[model samples]
Target chain A: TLQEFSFFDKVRRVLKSQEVYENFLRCIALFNQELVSGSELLQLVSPFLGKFPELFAQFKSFLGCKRIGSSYRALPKTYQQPKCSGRTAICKEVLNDTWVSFPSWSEDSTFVSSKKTPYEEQLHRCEDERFELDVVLETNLATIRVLESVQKKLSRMAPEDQEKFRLDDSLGGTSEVIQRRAIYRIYGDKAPEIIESLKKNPVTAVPVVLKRLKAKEEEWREAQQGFNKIWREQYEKAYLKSLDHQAVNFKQNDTKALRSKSLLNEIESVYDEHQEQHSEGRSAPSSEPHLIFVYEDRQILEDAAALISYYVKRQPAIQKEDQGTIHQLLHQFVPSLFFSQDDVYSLFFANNNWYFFLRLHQTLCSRLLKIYRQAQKQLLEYRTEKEREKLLCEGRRELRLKQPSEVELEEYYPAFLDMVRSLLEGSIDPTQYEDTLREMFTIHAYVGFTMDKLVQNIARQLHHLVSDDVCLKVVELYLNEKKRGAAGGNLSSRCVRAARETSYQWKAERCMADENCFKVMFLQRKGQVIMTIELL
Target chain B: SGGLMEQIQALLAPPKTDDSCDSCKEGGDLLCCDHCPAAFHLQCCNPPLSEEMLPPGEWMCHRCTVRRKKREQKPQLRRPFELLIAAAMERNPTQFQLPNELTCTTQHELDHNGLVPLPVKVCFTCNRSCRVAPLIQCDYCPLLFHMDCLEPPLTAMPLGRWMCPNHIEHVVLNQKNMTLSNRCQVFDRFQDTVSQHVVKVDFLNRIHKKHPP
Candidate 1:
């Protein structure tokens, strides 16, 4: 079957060889125009020679025939001569006339075929190369335009004559000095000196320069405003069109709407479950750490419950067996036990409060989910050679004949489930938990009513350590002024000065006050309440 | 007369009890007040005090004194129009085309026809471009640009030996030359100081060159 097609390939061979020489001549003819300068022609040809040297060498070899090479040389070399010769030398006469033009003469003039690919394939590659060249040229031109605009503005603002007085080593010798010397040679010393002095003291000598500059600036602003108006109008119209296209695409897909509906349903179910769980709570004690599990596995359930209980009794007020008091006890005991483990310490603090535990859990889980989804999306889109390897590994693995034994499956599956379950259980609630945690983050979100009051109490306690009366008064005044000014005019002048001074003082104080405050609030243990009195 | 003086004295006299007091039947206690410099009593004040007297010089309560002495001492300075002039100058220099008596003889009409062409030069006072033609000419270099060309153009051209635009009109002994004294007030003062300094510097430089080692 392969040998039968060989005849057709031979026919293709004759056509390909003929096309190569013809295309080369065509390119030469196109490049012969005056617009294609010598340097530009060299740039185009140099890259071609470097890229396909063997093919170029073959083309040059073919040209050594008496019909071609001798003809080019015997044409009187008019291109090299100073002036054009009136008479045109015919190709046949030139071929018979010249010997030096046939530089590489061999008895056998059989063309040595190129070992490399034919020029037809190489000619196709030039499109991308030309595009890249154009892009580079355009970028360079744009940069030059920007630079020229800046130079024009600078020269117009400080004319060459006035620039002399402002000269430093940076400007080298000023243009004004050169201009003055030139003027003096023609107009004499007295006239040039008067002009030089006027240029030097332009502010006093020529007051109208500033007025002209003002007029120019106004003109520039007016032009800029008109340009911006048209540009914005066109951009917004295009943006709206794109938005409509996206909306139409979204309607046709229907996937987003379905996903949104499903998410809403899931949220409603979660809300119902939450309300049901909390309804019977004789207030889930303040110390109870909220836990969520990924899968229904026995070992994971036991570990999660045990972890919660273990931390509950460590608090002095909580009974040893009290399920209600998990986090308070954990905060009291775990910090010391896990002092060597930084991650453990951070996790312990994370679980010590309903607020902190939830946010930390959400942050970790969301990041993991995002990475997992990105990997899944990339795996779906992969279509290249590297993707073939992944496909053979992931897809073909399932086709193995020996099915996993039940015992083997049980061993790995349960353990894997346990690992996943434990991770999720240790994490805070994944649904409304983020919103609840966001509400708890006092620095960023405004916690309503009760939590707000608690925050105020905390702030008041923290303020006690700031001992300077002036500093305290400044802080008080700032808070009061900020509150008053929040509804209206700029910060009062007094407030601005105080804010600046306070900022300086704060830097001077380092983070010592902040560290002390954190320690006071978070490091309390046993029955000790973290509290400070604020004198009114 | 004595009885009348006694009644008048009683009217003018300080009250028997302190004005701030209310419940002193046997006359108020003789003691310094807490807020004021004067003396009063426990029962003499409107809101009768339980204590007989506050400690001598330390009697004044916190209420009577200013809380912040520094703020009260240094008031803020106000300058509204200072920035207005600065902004105006930044936006555009002062370039006023003052009216002048010179008549243009050429009738060739251009885009700017009725108006006489101002000379093309920079104005000293405004630091802006001005075109002067049928306006005031310079006193020293008589090349005329415009009234707007002068540092401050003539409010009214005064009499002196005036130089014409072409430098042809020189000092006529008989005729009153107006351009010399027509220079702007600010420019005239600057010129006098500059001329004196230039002369002094030139004389000193000559002496130094003659006696050089």
Candidate 2:
């Protein structure tokens, strides 16, 4: 007996030879030209020579059908009856009997593969062939019919009307005719030739095509199972690593573990926010410490980054100073990051400087509240005392002109003066004091003007509260009233003489007027001017 | 008239009245401790007193006497507390292994002195100190239990009293014995209410009369 060979396997074996490969390439190209002819099968093999003639004959024999006399001859007995509307049945009609030219590999059109599995790669190869032929047929015919219809309808119009619709003049004189001929070569003229070849003849050659597709589908299933196993293993390892040491032991819950990726996402999100500020050239010392930077380990950095993001995201009430409370928060379900003073110092900080910024923000807020609160309390007391003084004046109309000394007995004015002197001589510059006053006013409403008047009174009372030189220096360096006036010998003497004369005049006016409209004094410090001291 | 000089001398000095009842703070009648300044009403005193029950001589509050005894015992020479504890553990090692189950009399003193620390937790079922699973502490006792190790196994933690199996029996028996008579009477009243049924239509009509459709 002669050795038996599976026809498809033998075809692959022959393709390994360079000579046979080149010949097969030419055979496909030859098939492409003879595609429209009724003598397609005859013309395809007749032009081949030597070993190709033998291989082509063998392939024809393997199809198991002869070109017998009758056109109504039945299909090969070995062919399975494909079900109607099935993919195989459609492939048999559209591809088998039809003179379907396989996509030929040209110099620019060589096959490419990737890291994709064999089954997916094979499926993609088939899809590519289908799409190429589909677009080639549809793209040509669709454009051709539209072009013909446009010409037919335009020619029926009057010559002037047709000329008006024509876009050729702006494009250049002969551009439309040249463009039309180019389109004719690509689609208009060749479209019918390709369509006729597709409609000419079809054969039952679906057995092999179905077998190959089924085999690839089976391979896909196997590869899918294999890839899923590795996916699960990788996910389990990553999920375990995402948990804290305590969570790994005691809280191996499914729903909780599912958020493993979310933790990574949080770290990524926080890094982006950090990246934006860092890229702008903000340094650690001169800027705000919004988050801690850790370089100890990648895992530790991710843990700390995620924790800082969570902390910043929540309300500040829960962000307590107590380490144990935050630790308990972690233990419940919040995150893997540990919260402790020592842990924060060691793991969270690249240098020990970050803690100071965090502490300083709290300290600044606390001190600001304390100073504003003390000033507000004294204002309330002063208002009450003023009310009593007003009542005492009403009881004794004669003594009303003799301004009650008891009302001014409140020490808040002296305290305010002391506070101003210290604030000027303190570490903060004048601009910061302006901010402090603005913030203080921002914190109060309704009784806001009461404190405002109190501050204004204290500013005006600077001269009377202290000596002349002290007032002059504070008024010049701190207040913005003196325009281009430096604290030199000439300016100081003139300012003092003018202030003394103005002060005596104001005191005389105050003594003349018994009403509350008398001006005590005036000094410009910062923002605002509602008649600085109206005395009401 | 003869005691007028003594009255004058007493009135010249500031008059001292007994301090307000230390417990109730309205001290017209009070039981004063001879040992301390703490005064209490007869009814307000712990292990309460009456006029007939009063001792002829010195009387003291329970807290003051206990404090006095504790101070008197403090100066005594130290005992071999650790050795005694070890001996007790050696005799019955299993009982002493579980937390809050068995303890030496001197355990509190040793803990106070920072000599031997107490075990923070040990599960009632496994009797082991490893906390691989979270432990729920008994509401009444120091005993702890894993939720999974309960008799029927607990799914969620309870907000109210969740007692250990051993300690729960005492509370259950206390309620059962005290409320046995009252429980029967209450059940009888409920049974009577259920037995006397009204027609569904009649009940609905009565409700409708008040609500008015």
Candidate 3:
């Protein structure tokens, strides 16, 4: 019985092979001539590949039957289907990327982000890249169709031969081949033609296409589950990150004003109504500190570099906190970077010294309001009175040029000024703690009521009060005007003289000669400005 | 005699009576504490105060002193949650570990959770991400805020049935039917002032108007 079944399997395989050969012969013969002639003749020459050069062109056409939102297209129970609408946005060929693609958010960073499970990993890895649930389902339907057509041909076999053949699981050489009797019945009368067609057919003549199709469907389900798991994690992460840190900037919203910006930073909010040329000049040290250089830690340099690089990419948008963190590293925590350290000054004069410190400062002021207010208090506290007189009578009588490098006033406000002063002085640098000290009095000095609540734009304008040359002259004149701890200085006397020289003045007087024709009237859409008479 | 002295003082008019010491300049004197405008000359003080012997940081005026005495006589209006929490714990074990965050100081401070430190989370309202201690977490929303940051502030940790603003709604227990009568239609795009009064609409009542059988 065993020998007989073996003999039967061989015979069945031979017969099945012949049928597939004829089927493919039918397909290949199209280019040569229209060979299959009948009212039953089918157009078997279907094209899946096309002339489009893009790698995904075939996939696009395959997707045309799909509804919007789902990526896969379903189709009829055959290999060939209707051609798709190719001119739509999804179907169109791109000349270039029209919109910027958002980079996949960092789900795999060692730092906190989405982490994946092992089961999800297997599902994604087990399937091929082309897996899609609809695509798999449709392909199985096509396989079902082919099986039905082939089975019909087998049923027409001679009764005797049909009795001899049976499809049992045990009877197979190939599953397709094991259907010996069907192959025999389909080809019997057309034996010579079938044999020749069989020579050209390339299918393994395996009829169980449905079996293979089912397996692929299983893979598709697994792959989709994994894709969903990953996608859900991405959505959750994006929501949290966007909620907390979207578009933050300690970035100089207004960077164009350097003289103004520095004036805002280290010094004045005022461009003085009177320029005050009569130098109520008080004694600056009448001397200078010699510079010294110190070696810095290579470790801090590299570590900070690495830290900045990591955040710079992810936190590139509106970054005030990250900027402030770097500023803190320079001014507060790092030893060699301290403002009082002479080496810090040496580095300040060096190529990247002040450049590094200033850039750091520009990022974020750790406590901009508190720092300014406290520094103002320090600025107002009493001086020994000797330094005031020395700056007035002693420093100038010798007729010494105050090479900006020579001016440092860490004496009064070491807490902030020392940090600012060392960085301020250098060759070709805007120098002095006085310059930094002055801005403290003026920042957030523009007082006006916000309507009901904080109107952010107006609030920001409150800090950016003065104009460019106003910021410049205020800074330039600050070295001359600052009598903060000075008493009986009448700094205002000289202030008026310099205001005239600058030709930019802000004093108030009667809208002269008439009934306020050209009043210095300032009123606003969101903010307020108006001039009151000097006497009024 | 006192009236004559007062007139003489008014005539001098160097500074206001309230801010200045009765016998001295306006700027520097005794307690201007608690937003009080009036100051005192230590010697000229009504009760004859001793300036040097006063123990001090900032001085409270006589008015403030009386107000404070009255306040102290009354029961404390509120108690802090920290006092409650400290009382609940049992015996402190010398061997027990104190969690780093749980450890604190007599004078506590915060770098105020440095920028992007620990993990960035923020209050739902201000959108400030810095997280210092005493943040009150909401039951439903994934949000927390410092006690001080809450508008109209919270006095203590809330009990059951507490909810964030978004989670709750305020409903008036009693509303009466009141109306101001006026009516207008499409033709009254620019008002003809048909009447000075407008009919009041009870918006919520319309939806649920006690559906009839």
Candidate 4:
């Protein structure tokens, strides 16, 4: 009976055998090596098992081999064989029969083959077809796996099977028809048609699928239109407006005549107006006045404009007022303003002419000039007197009146004489004394001269102020005191020694009545005070 | 119904127990505990004896029974109160408790229970916690501690693991015979022991020895 059965019976037998099932994987792997159609692969596998009828019968028993009795069958149809070379037709017909009997198994084989040869060059030719079939099969397997897992997890209930199946349907149950349509859209040219079919399906589920597809299509169209419109507008704006227009024309003769008639009339009117104004003893107002005003206004108007125009013309414009207000304030007090650049010199010369006039002309004219000259001479003398007083003060501040050794005093002696002569020749005015004192102190403060030099100079200046005979009397007394001190004797002898030591050399040259000879009298008085203080 | 009856028949068969052993029986050389039965070599047991010399009784691991019994018979004794106080005072160990008055002093009180009250001064040098027996007073304050209480503690600590009371991790037990002078101290006078220049010279000498050019 199994030998009399159809190709589906044989496939069902093979599916049930553990050995044949293992070999089936090997057959699928070998089928992937080249472009063998499903029919050719079936033929290759068939010969391996076809010679053993006992093994085929064992396979049939293993699959719980059921016979398709006349009572069990629903419909009968003729199976057509495929047209192919050699034994291929028979192989194709047998493979089609096997696939119809075990659709899931046939898909598993195709999926395994596709996965292995993903980058094969021939795959490109059938990529879309393969993708569609793969998506259909993967979706079906995923849905089945999820359902089986859910069933295994669900609680056992004798009466809940139909209710659970309904729930599964509501939760987007998988169907072969729906998968076929999805695949058709992916690989075939009938996407819209498939969508329409989905809408027309009796299941309430069709609307959701159709709506998602429609929305995706509309969004794609809108995005494409947006891109095209923006580019079109940009192209028009950038390139279309600059084209030359041939419609409007102007001749050269017409332009020349229009210019000459207006020019001649304007010239004649200007001449007539000028002649009338001349006869009336007034000049016509010329366009030159406007040009002059424009030139006068140029600097104020063109400050910022000058910077911009210099950049355009590539010229270097000097910045005149670069210094700020603080710089000008400091510049005013600088004494060398006249020797500065021409601008500063001119400003100073213009602003201070009065100073020049007063000093050079008004004060230097007539008898007043002679008086001024005499005053100048007196001023020179006054300076000399002040210089002498300065030297005297310097000597006094040094505290050298006691005079040590001659060799020690030699360096200071010349300075001392110079100071005495300066004092004698100086003016007697008290105001001059104050000035001289100030000058002396200033020199002392600044020069850092030695104390010995300052003291020697002071003693010389005092000697200049006393009478010469008195100075001689002082010198004699000083020498007598020194000799008596050397001999170890009396107060008068010591006084004579002190007086002689204190005497000024300049006083030694003058007569007793001479004003310069009063040095000794002053020294004698100063000596008495010194002797009294020393005794105390 | 037939399939269900066959499954029930399979489940009702009795289990075989031939491979199991009885762990609680007595007079065997095997030692048993809550989770395991093990045989030990005689030397490994406490009150160590040869296996041939073991008494004819049920044996248990030494750690499990004999050691526990010994621990119970005589508890671990703490160091005496006076000795503890002396150690605390001499070492000024970091974990010692601070006193009530918050300034360190030499005077203390011994209670009837033999516990000594700590001196009251808080160390001015270490701000985080106090040491009970401080070695020296701060020049400007009454607070006192060993010189090692100062930041960068006055003496060099050993190179390996070490921790003070304020250190965040567990203190390590030092095994090396660190010199008393070289040991770190808190709140102690530094100049009395070594000059700063000597410390710098020693440190430089050690570095030169290590790097030798």
Candidate 5:
């Protein structure tokens, strides 16, 4: 028998009346209370058919029963539910009046609870969210019903809001509300009008609104990403990068560049890793570039300076035998310290030839001492005016016997030595140094300075070649504060500006701004030149 | 191998000592000369004495050996003395070890070494005691000979086995008495003892055969 019932279970469920004939009691209650709404007999009933859905069909049939075998709309309009006829206003009336609460509930009270309760009997109404054939709805009268309807409909919808309903918090967190409050929150206030179709159909209007929202989403997300790669998810990277670019990432001046080489390498490699990770198209944000670089240059200058300092620091009257050493140290070690590093100082010096980085004049003056010593050795021969000219002529004759770089150095000899002599003798042309140097400073300040050889000579107390004034200027220009944003001078800002301009040219190549780094190439004469570098 | 023989042909001499048995520590009764420590036990040496006979010398030294080697390096052998051999003597000046003894008595024995003689016979030419002098003697002579002596014109004892010229002449002179008389009578029925020289034809054939080898 159970199996037989199973076979006809669906049919039995379909025909089975769910509730215990509630309409008999419903009419009895109506006769007792006698509702105030316009109706054949106003009544209120339970709205809890959902938790026990099996009884819902009978409960549903009991609704709109005044029509009595006729559809509710066709009941001559007289027997229609209270709200069906509009003579009555929907206001807080009673707590248990079904006629107002469930009025014409085919669309209302059936879907929304239309039944209201009496103020006096409010306790007897609304027991729980579910009702036992009682309860009603209420609200203030003299209120806007259209707004009520909108609020009602919105509450029912539970829309998944786009961007917190277009609140655009970019309108400052502490800002006063401006513009139309209605307009401000409504994404629709700014939304383009839905292109209407002749039929005024939903399909046409929705697509237009949807298309605009997609376009808005597309535009709003792409605000970041460099070099034509737009990624919406790169919001953090873009934001952080903007923070860094303002030079306010550190003490209001640092451009988020690491002055330490190891840290810069780590940051760059990490940047590279993030770039690889976010390379997927759907990923929101892009990795930011133009970040930190290293500061390995001080060690470079110091190490290079060390050789010269040690060599010249103890010059026992410019030993002639050490000249080869001086030549090699100048040609090899100096270039290595100034060129190999990709640091700020090295890059600049690699191109401009250590302009302010090394005390070239004072350093070259030390080399002059050796020649002066030779001149002093032949004091009798040097007594005549043309004797120095004979020495220069001899130097020219010696040129052919040496390698081309010897020529490379020789060509610079007197011109450089003259500058060195003036620097030492105190008549160094300030105008020339400034003209070259000013044309050189990157807009804001002098870059930096290294310890000058004049100062070194002073410490030795042996020979003072650098003119005192030029020596002071050399110390001021080259030896003072090198690091950016320091006290003494405006060198840091100028250095930062130089670095910024450097990157601008770097777009074309690694060292594009420093074309001079590759200035010399082997154009050696037909026979390869052999150099003699004697090691001590 | 001696001082005089070494001065003559130092360019062709062998090494001062044999290196072969230097590491061998068998410490046998018969051991190499103190100077030639690389040699095997004296009985097992190269250019050795006969299997039945031992050297008259107690201590072995390379000076005598190098002389013998140098002489062989020469183009031709030259005999310079009539008789050459060692006489009884102590090897070391202090007489710490025994030495070669052609003739000796109990009084010549040394404490460190087993036994020996004294007063080593002098050379035939210079008549000085033989210390490192390379010497020789004929079978018939008892006295030692020096390589520098010209009366007998001794040079080197070729192959460490020599028939001194005097001995060879002595043997030739006694050629008639060399017959195996009684022993041949026992074998007369089967053999003839006839020969131009006293040495038998079999022994002669072995010695004077025409094979270049």
Candidate 6:
């Protein structure tokens, strides 16, 4: 019986007839509220359910009303007496099984007596507010209904026509309305026509306008690409043109190039001075070509220049000898400085035949001098004691000397005397004689006693030496150091205080007087191998 | 195995030349053009050849020769003639006849069935082929040219890789634009097109509502 009600439950909700639906409700109300038994419930629904068989089956199972054995009853689990509170007048019928009941003074007497009180007035005010709110609710519902109808109409129409219903706000208006307003302002004379055209079939027409704009934009984009290509090509052409011009000018005005040319020209000018001295037989020495190159090697330039200077001092002897004799001697002695015969002429005669070889040599020599002078100037600027010590060793090494032999000096002294006599007589250039004098000084200083005695002898004959300015200059420097004894006190202090003090003092005085203190050094004390430098 | 080795050695060895001179067609000790099948005796050449050039290592036939100016250039190998001749001789010992003159001008005779013939190099400018007048080829392109046909004609053939004018222009022109100055004009025109239209503002909001920039 309970299983039959599951099907009845679906029919109960889906019933189409109003009469059947109302009767169905009445059957349930009578069963529950009136506490009708299964037989009476069946009797009450019989006439109505008889018209529809399905409805009869539905009613039969709805309350689970049925006659079983002797006693009439609803489903066992479902049947119950109505339950309600007895305190309320409405529930009295269920409790007492009566139709009506009178109100008692027990619960309501005080509420009834409290008329026009503050709480009652407050209640009245709340009631009035509720009525007012009900009016507002009614108006709000009415407005919503109207809006829903309007929205329905709007949805039914085409998209292009829907714009007709758009309204402006009370003040400034919506963005769409404002946009239309601006359009109207700009095209006031043709405003209506334009608006009509825009509004008519805008869904299709707007796409056409947008597509046209896009087509134009795409064309411009392609044109821009073409323009960009042409611009790049033209720019590169101009840039390359400028670069080629710059390359040509760079080769012409390069500092290294100009300096190289200037140095070569200077060497040529110097060579021009003794151009008349060149002999036809000497051309044989210049015949063999020697390749020379200039680069940034300081040591090579200085070594080559020194080699040239060495040969320069012996120019007279070289000139006196035959070409073969001189060439053979040059090759044997100073072969370390040159490669071929052009090099021999370059060192001695300053031959202009090998233009590139001489140019490179001059450039390298000039660069060497410039760099050496810059280094010397920087060393002078850094005049700290540590720097002086560093310079002393470096300078001594730069003008490093070889020990003199008595036999060598015996040969050198007479030549030195001849130079001095010629200098006094003004038979030779002063600059030439000065170089000879300086060379002699460097040689004699290698022997400690010999240089001191030599300086003493020269100082003794200072009256006669005064005739030669170069000789007098040398004598004055020595005499000045003599007058100011222990002048290189600082430099000599690095040596042994007791044993070598006087010797160091002599070395220091000689160095101080003859040249700058950078070249002056008395000690080479590494692992107690004490050695002294001559007038480097 | 020894027989196989002997065959391979025979295959690798250079083929023997005809005893008769190509110019005179007379029997003698003939010097072969190593690059071709042609052979010449000392007396048969236009200018008489010396005994010093006997047993020729790398010599060109009269028809295949080119004059060297300042430097000697290695001649390019064309369609293989000696290889084909040897292969044909091996395929059939008899009925193998050599062409009288295997010159570049005689392509019709040299074309053996479907075999690749010697390319008749044509000048890019003149559109003509010739064996006498020299044609220089561009290293970058397959195009050839007469030295005198160029815009600024080259007096002598360059001994290095020389690009054609078109390829040089392509290299010069082909670069990233990387430039931005001209875009101002394009943008200004776009701005004028937009700002002049009052309808643009209306569309802006409409478009913005759907898809903002």
Q: Report the C-alpha lDDT of model 3 over A1-536, residue by residue, as the tens digit.
A: 24324332432342233332232232333212333332212222121111112312322332222222223334434546445666577555653322223445566466333343333333343333224333434444444454555456556787666434443331232344323323332234543343333333312233343354355446545655665554454433343223322112211222222222332222111111111111212122422222112223333333333333333323344356645544444334333323222100101111112222333332222223344444445444423344575567655577233422111233333334333323322222332332333333332211111110112222122222222233223323322322331111223443444454222222212112221111111111122111111111
Residue-level lDDT for A10 in candidate 1: 34
Model 6: clashing residue pairs?
Answer: none
Provide the RMSD of all predictions against the true structure, rounded to 1 decimal: 47.9, 49.6, 47.5, 53.9, 60.3, 57.3
Q: Candidate 3 — which residues are off by over 4 angstroms? A: A1-207, A239-521, A524-536, B1-213
DockQ of candidate 5 is: 0.00
Who wins the TM-score comparison?
A: 3
TM-score of candidate 1 against the unseen true structure: 0.12
Give the whole-model CA lDDT for all candidates, comma-separated: 0.33, 0.38, 0.33, 0.33, 0.32, 0.40
Candidate 6, residues B1-213, lDDT tens digits: the string is: 112223323422322334767776777877787667878777756456778754536766555553332236646444577778766543411123458684221331212222212334345443334332566766534556677776667878788977554231222223335243354343233222322223422332333243445
Docking class of 4: incorrect
Instruction: Write one digit per residue (lDDT tens) for candidate 5, span A1-536.
Output: 24323322432342222221222222223233333122322222222122234344443342221222222222234554445333344443532333222243343234222332222122222122112111111111111232233234334443554212222221111322321221122233332222122013322233343344344334323421221242222332233222222112222121111112322232233333344333312223542332222222233334434444454645566654444445444555444433332012222212222222232332333334333333344343334444566556555675123322333333333443344334434465554542332222212111111123333432332122222333233223322322332211233354546555344324323433333221111111232211111100
What's the true lDDT of residue A22 in model 2? 36
Task: Give the DockQ (2 decimals) of all models.
Answer: 0.00, 0.00, 0.00, 0.01, 0.00, 0.00
Give stretches of model 6 more than 4 Å off. Answer: A1-205, A228-232, A235-248, A251-536, B1-213
The Cα error of candidate 6 at residue B147, in Å, is 58
Error of 3 at A253 (Å): 6.7
Candidate 3 chain B superposition, TM-score: 0.24
Per-residue C-alpha lDDT of model 2 across residues A391-458, encoded as one tens digit per residue: 78564677123532444435433443444444434444544543344333333311211222222222
Q: Please give me the total number of clashing residue pairs in predicted model 5.
A: 45
lDDT for model 5, please. 0.32
Q: After superposition, how far is residue A6 of candidate 6 from its true place, in Å?
A: 99
Native contact fraction (fnat) of model 1:
0.00
Task: Write model 6 residue lDDT over A1-536, tens digit each, in one string.
Answer: 34334444544443323334343444444354445566865765553344356666754654452333323333444547467555686655445442233444476355633433333433343344345434433433333343344445556777767655543221112234443443343334555564565455343333443343344345444644553454343333243232232332333333333332443433332232223123211122432222223333335443543443343334443333343442333333223223221101111111122233334344434433443444344344445544566657555665244644445445554454345445534587755553444344432211111121222222222222223454334334434543453223334342434234355345545534643221212221221211111111
Q: Candidate 4: where are CA atoms >4 Å away? A: A1-536, B1-119, B124-213
Query: How close is chain A of candidate 3 to the true chain A, as a TM-score?
Result: 0.20
